[PDB]
Paper text:
Omphalotin A derives from the C terminus of the [name] protein, and it is the [name] protein that methylates its own C terminus using S-adenosyl methionine (SAM). The structure of [name] reveals a complex catenane-like arrangement in which the peptide substrate is clamped with its amide nitrogen aligned for nucleophilic attack on the methyl group of SAM.
In both sinefungin complexes, the two nitrogen atoms (sinefungin and amide) approach close enough to form a hydrogen bond (distance varies between 3.1 and 3.3 Å).
Residue numbers in the entry:
A (entry chain A), B (entry chain A): 7 to 266, 278 to 384, 398 to 406
The structure:
Amino acid sequence: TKAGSLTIVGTGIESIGQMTLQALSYIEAAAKVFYCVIDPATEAFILTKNKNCVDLFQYYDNGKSRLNTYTQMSELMVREVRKGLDVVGVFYGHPGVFVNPSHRALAIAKSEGYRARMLPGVSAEDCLFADLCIDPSNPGCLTYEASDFLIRDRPVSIHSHLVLFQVGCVGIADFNFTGFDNNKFGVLVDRLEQEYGAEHPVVHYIAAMMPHQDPVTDKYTVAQLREPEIAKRVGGVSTFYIPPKARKASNLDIIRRLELRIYPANQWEPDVPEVEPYRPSDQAAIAQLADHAPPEQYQPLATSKAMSDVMTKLALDPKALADYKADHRAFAQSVPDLTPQERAALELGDSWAIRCAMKNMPSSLLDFPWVIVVGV
Amino acid sequence: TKAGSLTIVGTGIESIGQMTLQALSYIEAAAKVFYCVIDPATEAFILTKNKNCVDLFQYYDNGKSRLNTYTQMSELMVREVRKGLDVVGVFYGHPGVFVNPSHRALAIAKSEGYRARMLPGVSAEDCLFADLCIDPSNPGCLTYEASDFLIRDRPVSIHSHLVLFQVGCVGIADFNFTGFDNNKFGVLVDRLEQEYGAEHPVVHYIAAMMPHQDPVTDKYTVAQLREPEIAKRVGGVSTFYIPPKARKASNLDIIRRLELRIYPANQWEPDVPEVEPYRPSDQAAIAQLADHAPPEQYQPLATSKAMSDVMTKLALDPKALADYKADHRAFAQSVPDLTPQERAALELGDSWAIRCAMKNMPSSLLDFPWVIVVGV
Ligand SMILES: Nc1ncnc2c1ncn2[C@@H]1O[C@H](C[C@@H](N)CC[C@H](N)C(=O)O)[C@@H](O)[C@H]1O
Ligand SMILES: Nc1ncnc2c1ncn2[C@@H]1O[C@H](C[C@@H](N)CC[C@H](N)C(=O)O)[C@@H](O)[C@H]1O
């Protein structure tokens, strides 16, 4: 192994709260931290968690090519891992969703034979689903960088979700601290008008970045986007959501090969029918709650404090994880108050072992996770 | 206002660590918690954080329609909010990404005039980007439910990312505790063979669910998926990633209207060229680091412990947030050790105010966030 490592983590979109527990812990454990966040509470929070932090935001500048900024961000990180330190990069939202420097820095680090990992985080698209009450599954989701969408004239699906990032800097390769002059926005408004028509809805989406703020979820027509006062509101943290125009009919060849509207309807879709919550199926399913008992093959949790504790520290304590990863058996034996089954399950590391150790597994089942929460 | 509320939060995919700080805090604050998670460490962790929890997983059953399960899950939650309690639903990953019961339960609750919110979380798609080292921006991302993809014969873009959820239960509307017999998987393998050809790569992706485990990132050909031993490995937590076959050429009409390969290349793309990290642009940008000083319009953090504290509790303490949301001024005045500017910025709640209170704003700038981290 070569000394030094790079881990890139996210903070989520909304200030502090949308940081994951493993992001925070890796930040605490890092030798050097490099961060690029928008809001200052998040920044100040980060600075309390590690002493050796560097704000990457200072490598932006007026008129300066973002590509140069990204090279610089990524070089600054890889330099400290060549020195043998464990360095953590931090980017708002999800650190790999519309982010050049993370992918760049990890790819460089792995080519030189350093351990490199990205930990996922809550993206602005994630926030979009939550705030606009839509699900990517229904009826599919297409996601593009607004400029890339235009330059490679990427195809659109009228019967699916369309999400467009960086609508506030169409064609702009550089930066400005007072914001962009998004003067080529009308080119995008032309493209959407072509594909969706002038009265198709467009949702201007900006997720709250502070806990007390409401998101922006404003609905305009495509034509409205050309109005100067409306386009003015589109900025650097603007995302567009373009709902489907219609529902696509089901294929009859396929339904037969497989031998075969869910509430609620997508409210942003223009001509949605009202969908009923309590149809007969729903009525019947609900009546069954009265006498409902857990199926035979259901596995109730049956664990101990010692076991839940050790499984928590493995997830929250990167040091504990490193010891366990180095030797399952030695680690297992040294953790106190474990039953022989708990201690055995840690020794294997097996998902099955750990489920059997932590759950009251029924005989039927004994002789593999299955939790599907969407149906089409 | 009507008493009672519903908040749906996520736990992320990897056990405990991928839960966000605001998810955890709402779980702690809730009157009643209903959860649907895969792994038992996450479950046990949740049970330590609130006393009144109900496992929703017991409303699945062999042969039982998932739609009935989802109606039941959602009804159980809305029932407790009709009783006037503040109830939190918990679903693994992102609670609104391929999840019927969350959207269903919130839509019912809002139609009856109860406060209803979804908080986003780390999806399996989020984990995919991180583990497979890809970025949705480059070169766009299409995401479908595998059965929906077939039934509505949804169009594919050969020049973009394709992500397919629920590849392990093609056409299966029901549940089984010992896993699905995914016997109509060959229908999907036919569709992919049609659109991509028999030697196009397909990545079988399963994110580690436990901190010590490695993800599955196995690359098969489309033809290989028909081999019984290979299709056997596809399960309930399987996702497919289908890379682009080629790069789409740039539109010349559009580049002119806008008056106009980034390292690293997508390693899963079949015929990728090798991309250079240190081209001249990169060389030059890096040399500028030696004499680099923060631009004039850069705003260094300049805050106080009292201010960072209060901004942290607003994000981590839903009670503190509720008081602040009820009256900015009263709340601001009652928090100790705030400077007049800090205390004034809280009073307004304004993003600008709070940035000015927490950062040393340069004169130039004084007279609006802009943090774009991808370039095309
Ligand atoms: N608060 C927000 N609301 C909506 N979209 C946002 C927000 N912040 C960032 N974005 C989107 O993300 C783009 C900036 C990206 N370079 C970074 C995205 C970030 N990594 C994420 O996880 O979402 C912006 O142009 C927006 O399209
Ligand atoms: N560990 C995992 N690795 C890869 N994909 C997964 C994993 N767990 C769940 N999934 C995907 O999610 C589907 C189940 C969905 N109903 C729930 C998705 C979940 N809400 C999320 O945020 O990803 C599975 O069929 C997979 O396609």
